[PDB]
Amino acid sequence: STPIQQLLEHFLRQLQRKDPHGFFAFPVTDAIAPGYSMIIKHPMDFGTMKDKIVANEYKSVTEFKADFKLMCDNAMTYNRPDTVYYKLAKKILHAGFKMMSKERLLALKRSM
Amino acid sequence: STPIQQLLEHFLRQLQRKDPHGFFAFPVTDAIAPGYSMIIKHPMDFGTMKDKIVANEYKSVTEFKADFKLMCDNAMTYNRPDTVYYKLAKKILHAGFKMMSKERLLALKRSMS
Ligand SMILES: CCOC(=O)Nc1cc(-c2ccc(C)c(NS(C)(=O)=O)c2)nn2c(C)nnc12
């Protein structure tokens, strides 16, 4: 790996740790979630994010964060507020954005 | 746990792969190298650097690079130029400052958005 791949893999691992049951690990299928592919036109999941890291497709932590935000947003859009998926998405969106906050990235940038 | 620790571990693994015989793995003893402590007053080795990462004692990649350079510099100071230890220290020093150069660090710094 390159260093940037290492940093992204670290963040991804930290995020995945917040999803022990692997809800966000792979794309949501219509067989599990009726209408999903019509409601969510921009699907995303941690597997796809890993693959983009491996294929070296991310230029920046901002790009990585945007895919994470999309993933959580999709879950909060498709699922009703009282569901496990909505509540978990909400919790991890906020936690992940704190973990990768502008301030934390600035201190990391300083430490080089 | 933590981004800096992961990055330093990455650099450290890549450097240690260039020392297959493990000459730099642990502190050099006077038993191994006579008179070593009489000459080298600020010893360093990969083991100590690893412990420092794990204990999160490195606050910058600069602190890290300086320890690495000290390690190599010690080997070139104690051993003569036609020895395996001097030659390897020179080789790995060059390798490390290529890997952890300002150019390469700027590219990473930029990737932190
Ligand atoms: C006049 C003879 O001079 C020397 O023997 N010099 C040096 C010797 C070795 C060395 C040998 C054997 C072994 C097994 C190891 N590995 S270790 C320290 O973990 O036990 C290291 N490292 N070294 C380093 C660095 N810098 N100088 C030397």
Author numbering:
A (entry chain B): 138 to 249
B (entry chain A): 138 to 250
Tell me what the authors wrote about this structure, in their words.
Bromodomains (BRDs) are acetyl-lysine–dependent protein interaction modules that play a pivotal role in chromatin biology and control of gene expression. This interaction site is highly druggable, enabling the development of potent protein interaction inhibitors. To address this issue, we developed a promiscuous BRD inhibitor [bromosporine (BSP)] that broadly targets BRDs (including BETs) with nanomolar affinity, creating a tool for the identification of cellular processes and diseases where BRDs have a regulatory function.
In all cases, BSP was resolved well in the high-resolution structures and inserted into the acetyl-lysine binding cavity of each BRD module. The excellent shape complementarity with diverse acetyl-lysine binding sites explained its high binding potency, which we further characterized in solution by isothermal titration calorimetry (ITC). Although most BRD-containing proteins are expressed in HEK293 cells, we observed enriched binding to most high-affinity in vitro targets of BSP and also identified binding partners from larger complexes, such as the SWI/SNF BRD-containing proteins SMARCA2/SMARCA4 and PB1, which were most likely enriched as a result of a tight interaction with the BSP targets BRD7/BRD9 (22). In both cases, we observed displacement of proteins from chromatin, as evidenced by the fast recovery after bleaching. In the case of BRD9, we treated cells with the histone deacetylase inhibitor SAHA (suberoylanilide hydroxamic acid) to increase acetylation levels and to enhance binding.
